[PDB]
Amino acid sequence: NFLIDTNILNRIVDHAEVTEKTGVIEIGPGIGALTEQLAKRAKKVVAFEIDQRLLPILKDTLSPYENVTVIHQDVLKADVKSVIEEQFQDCDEIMVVANLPYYVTTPIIMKLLEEHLPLKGIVVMLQKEVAERMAADPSSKEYGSLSIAVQFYTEAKTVMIVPKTVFVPQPNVDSAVIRLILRDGPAVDVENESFFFQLIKASFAQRRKTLLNNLVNNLPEGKAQKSTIEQVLEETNIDGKRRGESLSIEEFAALSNGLYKALF
């Protein structure tokens, strides 16, 4: 859970480029070690607290800063659009910067991107394992369907490695800080976004088998339209004999679109 070191905290705020004119969404302030540091540099901070135990200390930590607003709501259940337009009226740019709990990590990140919010960016402390998959390029063992999904909406890059000793309960696993810069629009153009993500799952279902095999076993049209699939692979210049892990998002986008027309 709790981020002890003051130096690390400030490097986080540096990588989130927080200035006199930034609005900041924090998630999970604890005793407010990071929150205090954001209050010092942001125009306005909005922290989402759920935990009831630490709240009077957070209130003591946050007592001498007028520019912070604690919200007693799960960020997974909140309308971030409402909170945004309400609190960040004086703020030009918005950033999410948080130390996120280890279990809700991927879900929180994925709710926020799917909400299509006016965020400049998200900077977050999470598990090193999880951060390496998110910013994976296809030369990496960690490159999979989660790489594809966050790279759709944003530009992903790990910025920091942090040791276990920086936290109060020293965790099992090492941690890292990742920077996600929201793109202008989608990284690729697809007719059907939903079918595109089904495809990414199916292509990555078994890392040791061919693209062709994986599609035939994991698309619901695989067996019934195998010939049709083989056709679309050829027409899009994707050797079906390669692994899904060697394919780039440009190629998946091209293959999704192809298959959508031929299969439906």
mmCIF file of C-alpha atoms in Angstrom:
data_model
loop_
_atom_site.group_PDB
_atom_site.id
_atom_site.type_symbol
_atom_site.label_atom_id
_atom_site.label_comp_id
_atom_site.label_asym_id
_atom_site.label_seq_id
_atom_site.Cartn_x
_atom_site.Cartn_y
_atom_site.Cartn_z
ATOM 1 C CA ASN A 1 0.000 0.000 0.000
ATOM 2 C CA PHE A 2 1.654 3.255 1.318
ATOM 3 C CA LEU A 3 4.393 5.191 -0.560
ATOM 4 C CA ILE A 4 6.883 6.195 2.138
ATOM 5 C CA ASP A 5 9.727 8.048 0.295
ATOM 6 C CA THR A 6 9.529 11.850 -0.313
ATOM 7 C CA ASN A 7 12.047 11.859 -3.188
ATOM 8 C CA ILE A 8 10.109 9.286 -5.214
ATOM 9 C CA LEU A 9 6.886 11.173 -4.639
ATOM 10 C CA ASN A 10 8.359 14.344 -6.180
ATOM 11 C CA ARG A 11 9.853 12.563 -9.167
ATOM 12 C CA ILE A 12 6.259 11.332 -9.833
ATOM 13 C CA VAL A 13 4.972 14.923 -9.807
ATOM 14 C CA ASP A 14 7.908 15.868 -12.111
ATOM 15 C CA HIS A 15 6.978 13.127 -14.659
ATOM 16 C CA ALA A 16 3.331 14.302 -14.512
ATOM 17 C CA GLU A 17 4.585 17.833 -15.395
ATOM 18 C CA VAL A 18 2.361 19.483 -12.764
ATOM 19 C CA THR A 19 2.308 23.297 -12.987
ATOM 20 C CA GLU A 20 0.403 26.327 -11.607
ATOM 21 C CA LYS A 21 -2.320 25.586 -14.232
ATOM 22 C CA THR A 22 -2.828 21.760 -13.963
ATOM 23 C CA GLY A 23 -5.919 19.988 -12.584
ATOM 24 C CA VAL A 24 -5.094 16.663 -10.920
ATOM 25 C CA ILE A 25 -7.188 13.551 -10.217
ATOM 26 C CA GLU A 26 -5.560 11.458 -7.460
ATOM 27 C CA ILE A 27 -6.854 7.981 -6.660
ATOM 28 C CA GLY A 28 -6.156 6.475 -3.211
ATOM 29 C CA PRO A 29 -4.445 9.253 -1.211
ATOM 30 C CA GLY A 30 -3.836 7.225 2.032
ATOM 31 C CA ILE A 31 -2.483 9.618 4.655
ATOM 32 C CA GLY A 32 -1.975 12.054 1.733
ATOM 33 C CA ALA A 33 1.786 11.953 1.243
ATOM 34 C CA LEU A 34 1.496 12.392 -2.542
ATOM 35 C CA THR A 35 -1.659 14.574 -2.198
ATOM 36 C CA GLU A 36 0.257 17.196 -0.229
ATOM 37 C CA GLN A 37 2.937 17.224 -2.935
ATOM 38 C CA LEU A 38 0.341 17.767 -5.683
ATOM 39 C CA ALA A 39 -1.413 20.525 -3.712
ATOM 40 C CA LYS A 40 1.943 22.379 -3.624
ATOM 41 C CA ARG A 41 2.271 22.463 -7.444
ATOM 42 C CA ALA A 42 -1.226 22.062 -9.023
ATOM 43 C CA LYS A 43 -3.970 24.732 -9.308
ATOM 44 C CA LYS A 44 -6.443 22.160 -8.035
ATOM 45 C CA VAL A 45 -6.411 18.487 -6.860
ATOM 46 C CA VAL A 46 -9.326 16.015 -6.692
ATOM 47 C CA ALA A 47 -8.626 12.823 -4.746
ATOM 48 C CA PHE A 48 -11.014 9.855 -4.616
ATOM 49 C CA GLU A 49 -11.020 8.113 -1.171
ATOM 50 C CA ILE A 50 -12.849 4.900 -0.216
ATOM 51 C CA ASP A 51 -10.873 3.659 2.901
ATOM 52 C CA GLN A 52 -12.467 4.939 6.148
ATOM 53 C CA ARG A 53 -9.529 4.260 8.562
ATOM 54 C CA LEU A 54 -6.989 6.936 7.402
ATOM 55 C CA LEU A 55 -9.436 9.778 6.651
ATOM 56 C CA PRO A 56 -8.922 11.940 9.812
ATOM 57 C CA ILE A 57 -5.119 11.917 9.246
ATOM 58 C CA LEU A 58 -5.699 12.785 5.573
ATOM 59 C CA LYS A 59 -7.844 15.647 6.874
ATOM 60 C CA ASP A 60 -4.916 16.711 9.191
ATOM 61 C CA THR A 61 -2.358 16.377 6.323
ATOM 62 C CA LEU A 62 -4.660 18.334 3.993
ATOM 63 C CA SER A 63 -5.660 20.982 6.607
ATOM 64 C CA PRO A 64 -3.365 23.823 5.413
ATOM 65 C CA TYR A 65 -4.181 23.633 1.636
ATOM 66 C CA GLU A 66 -7.335 25.339 0.311
ATOM 67 C CA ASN A 67 -6.927 23.765 -3.221
ATOM 68 C CA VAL A 68 -7.802 20.114 -2.506
ATOM 69 C CA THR A 69 -11.188 18.381 -2.659
ATOM 70 C CA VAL A 70 -11.619 14.900 -1.230
ATOM 71 C CA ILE A 71 -14.471 12.847 -2.794
ATOM 72 C CA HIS A 72 -15.947 9.936 -0.771
ATOM 73 C CA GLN A 73 -16.652 7.811 -3.876
ATOM 74 C CA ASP A 74 -15.159 4.779 -5.736
ATOM 75 C CA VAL A 75 -13.505 6.130 -8.937
ATOM 76 C CA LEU A 76 -14.700 2.910 -10.670
ATOM 77 C CA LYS A 77 -18.339 3.972 -9.944
ATOM 78 C CA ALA A 78 -18.057 7.761 -10.462
ATOM 79 C CA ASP A 79 -18.981 9.912 -13.418
ATOM 80 C CA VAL A 80 -15.554 11.414 -14.018
ATOM 81 C CA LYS A 81 -17.024 13.743 -16.729
ATOM 82 C CA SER A 82 -19.252 15.420 -14.075
ATOM 83 C CA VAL A 83 -16.435 15.703 -11.543
ATOM 84 C CA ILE A 84 -14.168 17.091 -14.308
ATOM 85 C CA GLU A 85 -16.600 19.846 -15.413
ATOM 86 C CA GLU A 86 -17.368 21.187 -11.922
ATOM 87 C CA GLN A 87 -13.940 21.171 -10.208
ATOM 88 C CA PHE A 88 -11.492 22.029 -13.066
ATOM 89 C CA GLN A 89 -13.087 25.236 -14.362
ATOM 90 C CA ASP A 90 -9.930 27.343 -13.718
ATOM 91 C CA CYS A 91 -7.623 24.547 -15.038
ATOM 92 C CA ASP A 92 -6.562 24.330 -18.694
ATOM 93 C CA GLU A 93 -4.990 20.769 -18.655
ATOM 94 C CA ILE A 94 -6.009 17.679 -16.541
ATOM 95 C CA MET A 95 -3.782 14.769 -15.344
ATOM 96 C CA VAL A 96 -4.545 11.664 -13.346
ATOM 97 C CA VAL A 97 -1.662 10.874 -11.012
ATOM 98 C CA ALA A 98 -1.981 8.189 -8.364
ATOM 99 C CA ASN A 99 -0.435 5.388 -6.361
ATOM 100 C CA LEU A 100 -2.954 2.683 -7.256
ATOM 101 C CA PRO A 101 -3.716 -0.499 -5.180
ATOM 102 C CA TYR A 102 -2.314 -3.665 -6.817
ATOM 103 C CA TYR A 103 -5.632 -5.512 -7.540
ATOM 104 C CA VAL A 104 -7.813 -2.752 -9.125
ATOM 105 C CA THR A 105 -4.881 -1.490 -11.298
ATOM 106 C CA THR A 106 -5.750 -2.637 -14.871
ATOM 107 C CA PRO A 107 -9.547 -2.060 -14.270
ATOM 108 C CA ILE A 108 -9.119 1.565 -13.134
ATOM 109 C CA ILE A 109 -6.796 2.428 -16.045
ATOM 110 C CA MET A 110 -9.244 0.774 -18.439
ATOM 111 C CA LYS A 111 -12.385 2.482 -17.103
ATOM 112 C CA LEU A 112 -10.714 5.890 -17.455
ATOM 113 C CA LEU A 113 -9.612 5.454 -21.113
ATOM 114 C CA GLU A 114 -13.002 4.054 -22.093
ATOM 115 C CA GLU A 115 -14.722 7.153 -20.537
ATOM 116 C CA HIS A 116 -13.183 9.332 -23.303
ATOM 117 C CA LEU A 117 -12.293 12.134 -20.908
ATOM 118 C CA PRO A 118 -10.429 15.402 -21.612
ATOM 119 C CA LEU A 119 -7.242 14.104 -19.912
ATOM 120 C CA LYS A 120 -3.808 15.219 -21.042
ATOM 121 C CA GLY A 121 -2.414 12.118 -19.318
ATOM 122 C CA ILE A 122 -2.263 9.429 -16.627
ATOM 123 C CA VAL A 123 0.893 8.851 -14.531
ATOM 124 C CA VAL A 124 0.650 5.916 -12.037
ATOM 125 C CA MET A 125 2.631 3.697 -9.661
ATOM 126 C CA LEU A 126 1.704 0.071 -10.315
ATOM 127 C CA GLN A 127 3.350 -3.405 -10.433
ATOM 128 C CA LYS A 128 6.465 -3.576 -12.634
ATOM 129 C CA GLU A 129 4.953 -6.692 -14.364
ATOM 130 C CA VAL A 130 1.797 -4.807 -15.264
ATOM 131 C CA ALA A 131 3.706 -1.696 -16.449
ATOM 132 C CA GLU A 132 5.993 -3.659 -18.783
ATOM 133 C CA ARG A 133 2.974 -5.263 -20.565
ATOM 134 C CA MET A 134 1.250 -1.852 -20.995
ATOM 135 C CA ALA A 135 4.274 -0.222 -22.685
ATOM 136 C CA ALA A 136 5.388 -3.357 -24.552
ATOM 137 C CA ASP A 137 6.372 -3.117 -28.198
ATOM 138 C CA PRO A 138 6.269 -6.377 -30.199
ATOM 139 C CA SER A 139 10.029 -7.044 -29.534
ATOM 140 C CA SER A 140 9.035 -7.875 -25.909
ATOM 141 C CA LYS A 141 8.030 -11.182 -24.215
ATOM 142 C CA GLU A 142 5.405 -9.122 -22.299
ATOM 143 C CA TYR A 143 3.700 -7.851 -25.491
ATOM 144 C CA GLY A 144 0.059 -9.027 -25.494
ATOM 145 C CA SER A 145 -3.573 -7.914 -25.674
ATOM 146 C CA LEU A 146 -3.144 -5.401 -22.780
ATOM 147 C CA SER A 147 -0.343 -3.635 -24.661
ATOM 148 C CA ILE A 148 -2.746 -3.304 -27.610
ATOM 149 C CA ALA A 149 -5.602 -1.991 -25.502
ATOM 150 C CA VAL A 150 -3.759 0.876 -23.656
ATOM 151 C CA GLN A 151 -1.708 1.733 -26.777
ATOM 152 C CA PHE A 152 -5.038 2.177 -28.669
ATOM 153 C CA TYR A 153 -6.007 5.182 -26.551
ATOM 154 C CA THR A 154 -2.573 6.476 -25.385
ATOM 155 C CA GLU A 155 1.201 6.534 -25.763
ATOM 156 C CA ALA A 156 2.681 4.275 -23.081
ATOM 157 C CA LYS A 157 6.147 4.424 -21.495
ATOM 158 C CA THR A 158 7.524 3.271 -18.145
ATOM 159 C CA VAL A 159 9.414 6.207 -16.539
ATOM 160 C CA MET A 160 10.648 4.892 -13.133
ATOM 161 C CA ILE A 161 11.659 1.772 -11.230
ATOM 162 C CA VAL A 162 10.996 1.851 -7.492
ATOM 163 C CA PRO A 163 12.308 -0.726 -4.909
ATOM 164 C CA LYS A 164 10.167 -2.561 -2.288
ATOM 165 C CA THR A 165 11.698 -0.479 0.539
ATOM 166 C CA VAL A 166 10.007 2.739 -0.616
ATOM 167 C CA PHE A 167 6.578 1.403 0.753
ATOM 168 C CA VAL A 168 5.234 0.879 4.341
ATOM 169 C CA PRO A 169 4.144 -2.690 3.938
ATOM 170 C CA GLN A 170 7.038 -3.719 1.653
ATOM 171 C CA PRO A 171 5.250 -5.606 -1.131
ATOM 172 C CA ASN A 172 6.015 -9.041 -2.614
ATOM 173 C CA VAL A 173 6.718 -7.640 -6.087
ATOM 174 C CA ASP A 174 8.695 -4.673 -7.472
ATOM 175 C CA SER A 175 6.828 -1.560 -8.651
ATOM 176 C CA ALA A 176 7.147 0.955 -11.505
ATOM 177 C CA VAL A 177 5.708 4.263 -12.690
ATOM 178 C CA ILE A 178 4.116 4.451 -16.145
ATOM 179 C CA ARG A 179 3.191 7.509 -18.206
ATOM 180 C CA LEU A 180 0.213 7.352 -20.597
ATOM 181 C CA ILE A 181 -0.347 10.328 -22.900
ATOM 182 C CA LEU A 182 -3.834 10.275 -24.429
ATOM 183 C CA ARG A 183 -3.840 10.336 -28.269
ATOM 184 C CA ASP A 184 -5.822 12.847 -30.390
ATOM 185 C CA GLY A 185 -8.043 9.961 -31.511
ATOM 186 C CA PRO A 186 -7.637 6.148 -31.861
ATOM 187 C CA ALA A 187 -4.190 4.787 -32.804
ATOM 188 C CA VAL A 188 -5.967 2.928 -35.668
ATOM 189 C CA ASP A 189 -9.214 3.179 -37.687
ATOM 190 C CA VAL A 190 -11.576 0.205 -37.328
ATOM 191 C CA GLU A 191 -15.163 -0.187 -38.574
ATOM 192 C CA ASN A 192 -16.145 -2.216 -35.473
ATOM 193 C CA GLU A 193 -14.135 -1.446 -32.234
ATOM 194 C CA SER A 194 -15.766 -4.311 -30.399
ATOM 195 C CA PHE A 195 -14.884 -6.992 -32.987
ATOM 196 C CA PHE A 196 -11.356 -5.541 -33.071
ATOM 197 C CA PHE A 197 -10.859 -6.341 -29.387
ATOM 198 C CA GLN A 198 -12.396 -9.824 -29.706
ATOM 199 C CA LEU A 199 -9.740 -10.393 -32.383
ATOM 200 C CA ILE A 200 -6.892 -9.249 -30.192
ATOM 201 C CA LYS A 201 -8.033 -11.763 -27.460
ATOM 202 C CA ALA A 202 -8.332 -14.609 -29.910
ATOM 203 C CA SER A 203 -4.963 -13.939 -31.569
ATOM 204 C CA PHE A 204 -3.283 -13.996 -28.130
ATOM 205 C CA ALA A 205 -5.158 -16.960 -26.562
ATOM 206 C CA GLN A 206 -2.193 -19.391 -26.730
ATOM 207 C CA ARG A 207 1.247 -17.886 -27.166
ATOM 208 C CA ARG A 208 2.886 -20.998 -28.823
ATOM 209 C CA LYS A 209 0.456 -21.617 -31.746
ATOM 210 C CA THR A 210 0.072 -19.871 -35.121
ATOM 211 C CA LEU A 211 -2.205 -16.920 -35.851
ATOM 212 C CA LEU A 212 -4.239 -19.165 -38.126
ATOM 213 C CA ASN A 213 -4.698 -21.866 -35.510
ATOM 214 C CA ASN A 214 -5.655 -19.388 -32.798
ATOM 215 C CA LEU A 215 -8.284 -17.683 -34.939
ATOM 216 C CA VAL A 216 -9.842 -21.032 -35.952
ATOM 217 C CA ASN A 217 -10.040 -22.225 -32.344
ATOM 218 C CA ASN A 218 -11.081 -18.900 -30.658
ATOM 219 C CA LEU A 219 -13.294 -16.960 -33.120
ATOM 220 C CA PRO A 220 -16.861 -18.265 -33.095
ATOM 221 C CA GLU A 221 -16.591 -18.417 -36.965
ATOM 222 C CA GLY A 222 -13.220 -20.220 -36.890
ATOM 223 C CA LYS A 223 -14.297 -23.750 -37.826
ATOM 224 C CA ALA A 224 -17.240 -22.748 -39.989
ATOM 225 C CA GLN A 225 -15.381 -20.139 -42.141
ATOM 226 C CA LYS A 226 -11.742 -21.246 -41.942
ATOM 227 C CA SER A 227 -11.347 -20.862 -45.715
ATOM 228 C CA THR A 228 -12.766 -17.341 -45.504
ATOM 229 C CA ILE A 229 -10.272 -16.437 -42.739
ATOM 230 C CA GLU A 230 -7.324 -17.797 -44.821
ATOM 231 C CA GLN A 231 -8.546 -15.642 -47.657
ATOM 232 C CA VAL A 232 -8.628 -12.408 -45.615
ATOM 233 C CA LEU A 233 -5.057 -13.166 -44.272
ATOM 234 C CA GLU A 234 -3.775 -13.407 -47.847
ATOM 235 C CA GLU A 235 -5.686 -10.327 -49.044
ATOM 236 C CA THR A 236 -4.129 -8.347 -46.111
ATOM 237 C CA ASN A 237 -0.557 -9.768 -46.614
ATOM 238 C CA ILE A 238 -0.429 -11.410 -43.175
ATOM 239 C CA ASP A 239 1.342 -14.757 -43.203
ATOM 240 C CA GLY A 240 -1.050 -16.872 -41.126
ATOM 241 C CA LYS A 241 1.833 -19.126 -40.140
ATOM 242 C CA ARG A 242 3.336 -16.499 -37.819
ATOM 243 C CA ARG A 243 2.377 -15.905 -34.180
ATOM 244 C CA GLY A 244 -0.134 -13.256 -33.123
ATOM 245 C CA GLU A 245 2.578 -11.794 -30.884
ATOM 246 C CA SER A 246 4.623 -10.731 -33.955
ATOM 247 C CA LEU A 247 1.766 -8.600 -35.360
ATOM 248 C CA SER A 248 1.601 -4.822 -35.013
ATOM 249 C CA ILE A 249 -1.477 -2.817 -34.157
ATOM 250 C CA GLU A 250 -1.525 -1.525 -37.779
ATOM 251 C CA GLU A 251 -1.779 -5.155 -38.962
ATOM 252 C CA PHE A 252 -4.475 -6.105 -36.362
ATOM 253 C CA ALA A 253 -6.530 -3.082 -37.420
ATOM 254 C CA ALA A 254 -6.220 -4.129 -41.087
ATOM 255 C CA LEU A 255 -7.151 -7.771 -40.269
ATOM 256 C CA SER A 256 -10.121 -6.840 -38.004
ATOM 257 C CA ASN A 257 -11.673 -4.693 -40.783
ATOM 258 C CA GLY A 258 -11.122 -7.458 -43.365
ATOM 259 C CA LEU A 259 -12.654 -10.176 -41.258
ATOM 260 C CA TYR A 260 -15.613 -7.975 -40.246
ATOM 261 C CA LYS A 261 -16.696 -7.669 -43.913
ATOM 262 C CA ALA A 262 -16.104 -11.311 -44.852
ATOM 263 C CA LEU A 263 -17.543 -13.059 -41.786
ATOM 264 C CA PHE A 264 -20.897 -11.274 -41.006
#
